[PDB]
């Protein structure tokens, strides 16, 4: 049972990294299960999604919540749409290996990735 928490964008950093205001504090977040080999495109895509959002949500998974560099490991939602999956579906990123038990949406993203590859979209072109 994963819970979505409200957050506020502070600065877009790149395809799978953004800075947010979470629980009265700024924190860098690394989008779970998404690897970025189109770097500028992914960055642009994510940047557009969060900056144009009227609601940003942070959803931690069931495993470790922060990586070695202190970045929050989570699923980020823009207006209810998961950025992690959108990137993958748009073929602007691949599904990463599960990390410390954070695999709740792994299957979901794998299908997005399969369809993207089936459409030979961007990184799959």
Swiss-Prot record:
Catalytic machinery residues: 30, 71
Compositional bias (Basic and acidic residues): 105-121
Segments for region (Disordered): 105-125
Residues the entry annotates as binding Ca(2+): 16, 35-36
Source organism superkingdom: Bacteria
Subcellular location: Secreted
Record-given protein name: Nuclease A
Protein species of origin: Staphylococcus aureus
Lineage of the species this protein comes from: Bacteria, Bacillati, Bacillota, Bacilli, Bacillales
Residues of the full protein shown: 88 to 223 of 231
